[PDB]
Amino acid sequence: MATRTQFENSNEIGVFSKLTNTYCLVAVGGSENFYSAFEAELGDAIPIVHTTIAGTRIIGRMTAGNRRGLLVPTQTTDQELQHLRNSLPDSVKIQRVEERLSALGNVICCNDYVALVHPDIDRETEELISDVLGVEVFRQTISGNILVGSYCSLSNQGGLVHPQTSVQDQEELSSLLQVPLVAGTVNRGSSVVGAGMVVNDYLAVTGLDTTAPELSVIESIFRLQ
Amino acid sequence: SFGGINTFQQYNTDLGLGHNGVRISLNYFDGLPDPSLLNSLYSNELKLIFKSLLKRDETTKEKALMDLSNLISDFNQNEYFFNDIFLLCWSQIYAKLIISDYKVIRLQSHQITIMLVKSLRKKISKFLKDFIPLILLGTCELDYSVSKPSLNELTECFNKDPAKINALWAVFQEQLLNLVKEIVVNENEDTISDERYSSKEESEFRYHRVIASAVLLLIKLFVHNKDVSERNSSSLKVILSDESIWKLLNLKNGQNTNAYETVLRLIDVLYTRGYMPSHKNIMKLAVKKLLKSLTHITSKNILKVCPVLPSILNLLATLDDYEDGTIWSYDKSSKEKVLKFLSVSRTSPSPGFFNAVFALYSSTKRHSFLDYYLEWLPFWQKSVQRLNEKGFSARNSAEVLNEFWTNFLKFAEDSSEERVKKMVESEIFNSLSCGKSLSEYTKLNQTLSGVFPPDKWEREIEDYFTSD
Amino acid sequence: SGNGAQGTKFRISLGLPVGAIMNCADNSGARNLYIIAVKGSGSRLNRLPAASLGDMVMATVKKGKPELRKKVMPAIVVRQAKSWRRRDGVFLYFEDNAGVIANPKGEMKGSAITGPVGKECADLWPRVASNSGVVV
Amino acid sequence: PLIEEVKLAVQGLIDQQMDWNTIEKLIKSEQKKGNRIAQLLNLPLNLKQNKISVKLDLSSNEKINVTIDLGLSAYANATEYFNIKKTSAQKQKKVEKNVGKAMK
RNA sequence: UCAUCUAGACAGCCGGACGGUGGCCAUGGAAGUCGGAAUCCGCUAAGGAGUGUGUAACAACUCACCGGCCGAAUGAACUAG
RNA sequence: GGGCGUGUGGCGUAGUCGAGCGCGCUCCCUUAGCAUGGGAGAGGUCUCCGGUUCGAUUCCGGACUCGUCCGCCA
């Protein structure tokens, strides 16, 4: 399933949510339908944490997540950090990042094995990503889009990239990430695919205005069947 | 509250899937619950849930389903609410609910039906004839996620008895056949999906998925009952006759080759049964489609189609075995298709591909379908060249190389020619000298235990030390 | 703001009246935006309609590309440079006035934002938070 | 008698409030099924004006499609056709008087 | 100014409200009720060649007329303080 | 703002309730030049919408458009 969901009318689910294999994060100011989608589809096996990052309802663009670790910005308060430490399982590691770009979901596009980052990140932050997430890192842009997290949706099975992407960039990124990539649109043609939707190994959640060919492209590239 | 009469349905006099006097059909236009029956419903709350289910929006449908489930969960309080009238209405809507695109809607519907059956056990017997085929269709589904919970629930409903589950197939085999026939022939993509709200694509995609699940159910029916084919031969013939099952075998388009694979399994089943041999036209049509599928396979999509290729080859070997390759005779260009396919298949390495190729070679050689020297020897050599180039860049390669060698050596054994043997030795030497991580990898070395004599290996080792 | 607001906004000290020229932060090829109107502003005699951070305004491109000049389009203020108070009581300000171009529903005409944006704007507009590099 | 039956069947679907496009798809399906009533109806339906056209055989082979108002009784629909004929006859008479003078 | 009125008036209930005759023209039909003319008898306590609803035309219902209960004034049109 | 009148082929223009000419150019013929003429062509929802008539360019009503004339203060 690519599950049709709105955040109070918003068809961008990746902005307000962060979904990994092991956990899920949702914003505190959410509707009953928005919570019920993650509660029904994810089930009781996977914890869902209602969280606020840096005083903001936006959490997907603020944080970058992995099954092994979670990265939070410097502006995240101690109460939010302690609540995430209690609510999250003991396996994941939560570490604050002290870096100027500070919006880790926009900066970092990552999965379990390999990650794409903004080219201009600091070397200490790159080593921190490689340490906490245990993930090999490449500094690359998707056809000149420096915000790889906003302009790519990535999982273990496959990836969706920006629609206006050069084909040469598509095989280059596909060989670099060792996963097949498809250029496509989400939410009735919105270009920002990573902000448009969240995905993991068995679930994808998207906006209600995402059309049927777009949803078919999602389930084909992410192998959710 | 509910108005109107299904006068056309009364004229039609067809109960469709339903054997309880209520027409049940997958298509949206007909099979909708009758207004008078809805009025007869026990409670206002039930009537409301039904209206919501009728409404198109999924969010509304889900909310209604959740409410219905809650009523079922509190069975003792709501036993009065549930009635035969409710069951008749539920059956008609349930069919539409199973066909629904949304996964949750399907999952919930199956869960709801199973819960009802457990609570109402021994009271749903009249309605079981309608319910069980639909429940079974859900249990055997192309999608694993919907099917596994449903299967587990079904077993729990039957108190974890495998025998009871097997019995169900035997008891409802005729009913299952009717359902399968309806999906395969009566249903069309347009009937399944409304034209205005759905594109030409998706409607086709949906239809293919639904029929594929029915085909999987059919395969299960044959496995469960040995005598099912004989009793319902006429029905089986019509299902096979319809081109829709054959249409499923298209490799040019489609997200997954799983549907194509399911049909291949059915064809093997037909061969084992001998049903296809018994009815010649069906067998010929299937073979022709399979040959067309080979044309559909292309280099651009080879990576997607590569896992499926070994399976196709094994099936081809069995069909090819039948009647001394009459399958090839059916198509004038069948040999050409195979040769084109071979070039496409070799370029992308696949596990089990060489084994299939050797088996096909063995089948072909009895009738000399493929010339050993003209086509096969070069093809095998090209495969080695490709493998050497891929040394072992995407291992796996190590097993694939061994698999190729074992098959190639057997292929080489059936030559009786010095030149072929020399070529094999040269290819082995070329692979060995270039090497790779193979000396380091025990598995690669162990798997390819011998391609040359032990003395020759010592001589090569001596030569390497001797070499500058 | 008005239609495309995702939630409400606390009162930020108004810093951009009508006639203000702010930098154009996105990559749409426009250099500055000239504010002619503020969405949702009230009516008082002689009072100029003023904008704050996170507000949607009507603006014209005074300097930039000729297909963007000489027409009115909606814009969103992302940097304010007049100091305002949050409910945790820090007084903060950027060093320039800056906004991006959008449609009336709020999705950005451009694709990337240079420089920081305010969290009071990023929470209120998700597309701005999507294309934003750093949110403070 | 047949026309009345056809009207009742169509009306019942309309009373249900089923989507008009959906109703039409059902009619087509019934024709494939061979339902007699379904066969009689022409496939395009002026539901918006509440008129259904049903083919009627000229001789009890060629069929002439006749529009029938759903609201009106079958006989009432017939009277309206007769009325159009009557008006046409009156017009013809006026034309006949007009022709001689007009020609001059 | 017209009418009705203890020989039972006007409101309210209840019952009948019929035959010649589907009166004559005209219409594919129109039988009291699409129209054109005439508009008369019988039985009457009383019932129009019809006041509306009414059907393709019927059928059906209701009327204005007469009757049981009520027992005494009432209805219409108009004038001006 | 108000009043009065106006609206025809690509262009100009004739119309009593029963759309013609000229110009542009379509073709053909015709030319010692300082390049003509001749013959068959195409071309309109008569500004639009309603009513009258039997039929309105024509009669009437409304709308659009254009052109004229008169209009704020101390």
Ligand SMILES: [Mg+2]
């Ligand atoms: Mg002023």
